[PDB]
Amino acid sequence: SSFVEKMKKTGRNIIVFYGSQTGTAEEFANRLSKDAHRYGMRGMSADPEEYDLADLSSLPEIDNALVVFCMATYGEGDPTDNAQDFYDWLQETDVDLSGVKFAVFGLGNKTYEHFNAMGKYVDKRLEQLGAQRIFELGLGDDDGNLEEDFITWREQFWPAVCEHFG
Ligand SMILES: Cc1cc2nc3c(=O)[nH]c(=O)nc-3n(C[C@H](O)[C@H](O)[C@H](O)COP(=O)(O)O)c2cc1C
Numbered sequence: 001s002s003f004v005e006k007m008k009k010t011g012r013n014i015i016v017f018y019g020s021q022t023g024t025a026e027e028f029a030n031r032l033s034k035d036a037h038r039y040g041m042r043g044m045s046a047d048p049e050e051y052d053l054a055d056l057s058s059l060p061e062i063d064n065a066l067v068v069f070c071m072a073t074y075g076e077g078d079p080t081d082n083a084q085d086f087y088d089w090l091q092e093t094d095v096d097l098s099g100v101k102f103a104v105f106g107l108g109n110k111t112y113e114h115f116n117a118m119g120k121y122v123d124k125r126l127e128q129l130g131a132q133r134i135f136e137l138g139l140g141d142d143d144g145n146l147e148e149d150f151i152t153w154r155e156q157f158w159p160a161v162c163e164h165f166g
């Protein structure tokens with residue numbers, strides 16, 4: 001039903017959504033969610049298409065809640081198929097996301113004109129709606145070494161998360 005309800009009943013405070021077509025963003029999401037345990041927290045990865053992201057407004061019910069988005073960009077700067085509902089919702093919504101804390105890691109390739117469009121958009125839109133960005137937008141480049149871009153981001157991400165939540 002609701003992802004916030006699932007997190008509450010399974011003890012998770014971190015949820016990582018993945019916008020993926022070929023599985024790269026899903027694997028990064030799984031890796032980030034497992035990392036949570038190394039810092040005394042608990043996370044889970046999730047396919048946004050299976051949920052209603054309007055529920056983000058209920059996230060502040062969970063202590064030290066953090067939502068992370070690992071999003072790939074396809075086509076003409078389009079979202080992946082599984083992130084279309086989320087993309088559509090983001091464009092038309094006006095909900096207040098005060099209290100929400102987020103971070104975004106975008107998967108793209110610098111050779112396309114619309115480099116990491118999806119990741120850049122989600123990052124910008126969440127802040128516009130009232131959410132608080134806890135760590136800078138990661139811009140992974142699949143034309144170079146995406147894996148290394150991810151590791152560099154992740155290496156600095158956790159210390160920042162720990163710093164923020166104490
Ligand atoms: C057919 C196709 C089109 C792509 N189009 C874009 C694009 O317009 N912008 C961009 O930054 N990256 C683009 N990329 C590259 C990616 O988003 C990169 O491969 C990402 O790692 C894919 O993640 P995923 O496995 O989770 O689906 C494209 C990749 C493919 C195969």
Ligand SMILES: [Ca+2]
Pocket residue numbers: 098099130
């Ligand atoms: Ca506010």
